[PDB]
PDB file of C-alpha atoms in Angstrom:
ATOM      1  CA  UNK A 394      78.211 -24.021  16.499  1.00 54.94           C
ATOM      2  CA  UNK A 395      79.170 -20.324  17.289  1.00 58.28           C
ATOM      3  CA  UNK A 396      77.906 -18.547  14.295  1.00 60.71           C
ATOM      4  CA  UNK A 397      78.268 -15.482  14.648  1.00 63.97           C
ATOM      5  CA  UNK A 398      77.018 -11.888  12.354  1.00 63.42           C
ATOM      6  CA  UNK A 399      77.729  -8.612  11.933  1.00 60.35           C
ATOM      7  CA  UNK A 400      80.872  -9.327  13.847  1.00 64.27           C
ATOM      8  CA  UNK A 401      84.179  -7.571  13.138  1.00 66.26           C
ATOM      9  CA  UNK A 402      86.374 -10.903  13.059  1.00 68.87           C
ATOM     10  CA  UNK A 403      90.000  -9.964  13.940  1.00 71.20           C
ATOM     11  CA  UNK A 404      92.073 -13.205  12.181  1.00 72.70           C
ATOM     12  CA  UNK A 405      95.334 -10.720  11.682  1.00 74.22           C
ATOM     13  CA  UNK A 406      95.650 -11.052  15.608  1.00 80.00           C
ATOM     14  CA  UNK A 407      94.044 -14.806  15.957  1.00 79.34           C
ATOM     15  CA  UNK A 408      96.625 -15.588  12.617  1.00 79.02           C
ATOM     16  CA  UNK A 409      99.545 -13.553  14.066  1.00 78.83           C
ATOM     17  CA  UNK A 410      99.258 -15.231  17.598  1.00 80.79           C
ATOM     18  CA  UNK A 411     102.089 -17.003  17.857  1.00 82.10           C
ATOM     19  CA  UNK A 412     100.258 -19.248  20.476  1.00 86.81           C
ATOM     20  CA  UNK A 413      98.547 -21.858  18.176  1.00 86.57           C
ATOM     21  CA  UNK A 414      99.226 -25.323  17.160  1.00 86.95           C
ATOM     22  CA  UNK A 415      98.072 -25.211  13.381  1.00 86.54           C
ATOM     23  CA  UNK A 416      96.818 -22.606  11.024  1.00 87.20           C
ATOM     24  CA  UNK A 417      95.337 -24.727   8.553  1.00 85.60           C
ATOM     25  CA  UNK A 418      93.363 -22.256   6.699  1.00 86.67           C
ATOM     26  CA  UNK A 426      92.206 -12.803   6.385  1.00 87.12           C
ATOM     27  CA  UNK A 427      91.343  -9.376   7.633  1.00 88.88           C
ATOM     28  CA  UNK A 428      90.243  -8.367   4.073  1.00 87.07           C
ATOM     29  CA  UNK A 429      87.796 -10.545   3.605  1.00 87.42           C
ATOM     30  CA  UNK A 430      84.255 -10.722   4.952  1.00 80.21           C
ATOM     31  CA  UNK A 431      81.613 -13.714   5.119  1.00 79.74           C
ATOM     32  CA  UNK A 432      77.965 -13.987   6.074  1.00 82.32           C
ATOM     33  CA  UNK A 433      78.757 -15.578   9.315  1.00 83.08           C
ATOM     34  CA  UNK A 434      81.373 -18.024  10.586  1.00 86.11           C
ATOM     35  CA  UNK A 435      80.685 -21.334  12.112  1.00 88.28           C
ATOM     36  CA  UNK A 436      83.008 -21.599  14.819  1.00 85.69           C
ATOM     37  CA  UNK A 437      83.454 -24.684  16.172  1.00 87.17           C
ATOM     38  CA  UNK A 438      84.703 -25.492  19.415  1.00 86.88           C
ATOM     39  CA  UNK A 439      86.010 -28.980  20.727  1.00 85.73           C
ATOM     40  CA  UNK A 440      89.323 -30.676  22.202  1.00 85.32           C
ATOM     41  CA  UNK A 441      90.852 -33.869  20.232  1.00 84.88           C
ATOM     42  CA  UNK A 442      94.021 -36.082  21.012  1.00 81.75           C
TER      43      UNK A 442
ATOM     44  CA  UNK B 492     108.381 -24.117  -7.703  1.00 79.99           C
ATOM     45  CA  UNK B 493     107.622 -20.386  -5.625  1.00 76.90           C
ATOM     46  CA  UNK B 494     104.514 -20.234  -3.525  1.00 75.49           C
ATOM     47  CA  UNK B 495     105.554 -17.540  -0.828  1.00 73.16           C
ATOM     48  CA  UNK B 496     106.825 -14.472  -2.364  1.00 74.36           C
ATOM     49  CA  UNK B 497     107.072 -10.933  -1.084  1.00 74.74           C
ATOM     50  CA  UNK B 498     105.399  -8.981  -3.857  1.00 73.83           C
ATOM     51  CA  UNK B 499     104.870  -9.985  -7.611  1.00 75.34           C
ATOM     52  CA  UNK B 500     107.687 -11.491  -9.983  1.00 74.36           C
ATOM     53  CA  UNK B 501     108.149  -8.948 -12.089  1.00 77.40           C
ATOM     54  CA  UNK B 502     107.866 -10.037 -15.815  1.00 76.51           C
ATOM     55  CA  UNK B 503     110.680 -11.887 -17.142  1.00 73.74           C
ATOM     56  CA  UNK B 504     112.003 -11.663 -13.880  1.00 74.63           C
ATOM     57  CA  UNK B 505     113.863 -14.812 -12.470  1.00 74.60           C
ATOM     58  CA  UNK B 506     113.786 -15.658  -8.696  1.00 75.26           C
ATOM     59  CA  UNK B 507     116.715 -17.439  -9.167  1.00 76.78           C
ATOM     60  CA  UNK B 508     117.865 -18.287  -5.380  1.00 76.94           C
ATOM     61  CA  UNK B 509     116.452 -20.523  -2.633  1.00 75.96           C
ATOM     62  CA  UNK B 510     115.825 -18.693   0.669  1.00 77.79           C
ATOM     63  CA  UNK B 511     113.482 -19.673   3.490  1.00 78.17           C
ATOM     64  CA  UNK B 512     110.383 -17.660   3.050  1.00 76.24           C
ATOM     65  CA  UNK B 513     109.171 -15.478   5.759  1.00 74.22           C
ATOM     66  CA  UNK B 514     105.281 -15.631   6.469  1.00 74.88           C
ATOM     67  CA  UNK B 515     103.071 -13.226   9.421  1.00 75.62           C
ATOM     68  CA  UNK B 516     105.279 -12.184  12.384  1.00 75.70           C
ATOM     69  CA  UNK B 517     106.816 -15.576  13.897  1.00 74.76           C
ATOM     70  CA  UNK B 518     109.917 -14.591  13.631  1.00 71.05           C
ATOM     71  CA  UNK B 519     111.439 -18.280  11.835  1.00 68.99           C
ATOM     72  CA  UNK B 520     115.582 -17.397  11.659  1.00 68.71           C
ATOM     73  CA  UNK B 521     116.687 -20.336   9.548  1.00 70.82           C
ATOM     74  CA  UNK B 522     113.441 -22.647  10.955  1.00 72.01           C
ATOM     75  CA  UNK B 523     110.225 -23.653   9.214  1.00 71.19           C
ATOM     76  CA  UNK B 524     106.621 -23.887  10.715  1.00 70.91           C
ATOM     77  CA  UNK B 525     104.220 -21.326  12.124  1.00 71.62           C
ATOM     78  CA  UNK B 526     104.417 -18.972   9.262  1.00 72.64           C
ATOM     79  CA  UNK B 527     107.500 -20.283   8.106  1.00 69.64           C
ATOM     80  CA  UNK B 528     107.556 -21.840   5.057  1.00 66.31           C
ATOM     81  CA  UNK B 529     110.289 -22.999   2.309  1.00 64.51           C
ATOM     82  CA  UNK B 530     109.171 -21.327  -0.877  1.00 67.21           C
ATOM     83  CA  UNK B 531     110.396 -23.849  -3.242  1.00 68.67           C
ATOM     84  CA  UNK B 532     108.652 -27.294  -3.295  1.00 68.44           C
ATOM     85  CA  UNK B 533     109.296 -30.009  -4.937  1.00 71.38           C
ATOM     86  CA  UNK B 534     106.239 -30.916  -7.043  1.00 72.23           C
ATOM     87  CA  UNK B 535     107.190 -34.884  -8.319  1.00 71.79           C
ATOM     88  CA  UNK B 536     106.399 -35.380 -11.964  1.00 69.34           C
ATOM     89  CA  UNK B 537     104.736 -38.845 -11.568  1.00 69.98           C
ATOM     90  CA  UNK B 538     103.836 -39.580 -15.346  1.00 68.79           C
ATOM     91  CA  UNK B 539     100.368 -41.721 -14.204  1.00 70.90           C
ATOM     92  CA  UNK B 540      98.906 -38.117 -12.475  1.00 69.58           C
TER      93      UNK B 540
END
């Protein structure tokens, strides 16, 4: 778990990548923190 | 039915056409997938729902 605060979270460049598989889900919105996951599957 | 639409239908305003929808910058040119989607689904009135 990568959660992360007080972190300005660019999506806009993560969502507008165009080197991604799927966006299955952003800039104007703010959270308490984001549990980022990170992992490989087939 | 429209889900991707540039701005707001204005009111009484009909959408009438069926163009591929254009979503954040992948530029799609007739092709859907990253951020290219067709606006109009097909929603299937199954009468048991």
């Amino acid at each position: 778990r990568k959660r992360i605060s007080n972190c300005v979270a660019d999506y806009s460049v993560l969502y507008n990548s165009a080197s991604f598989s799927t966006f299955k889900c952003l800039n104007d919105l703010c959270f308490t923190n984001v549990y980022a996951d990170s992992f490989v599957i087939r | 039915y429209r889900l991707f639409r540039k701005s707001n239908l204005k009111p009484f305003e009909r959408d009438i056409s069926t163009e591929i929808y254009q979503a954040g910058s992948t530029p799609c040119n007739g092709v859907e997938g990253f951020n290219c989607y067709f606006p109009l689904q097909s929603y299937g009135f199954q009468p048991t729902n």
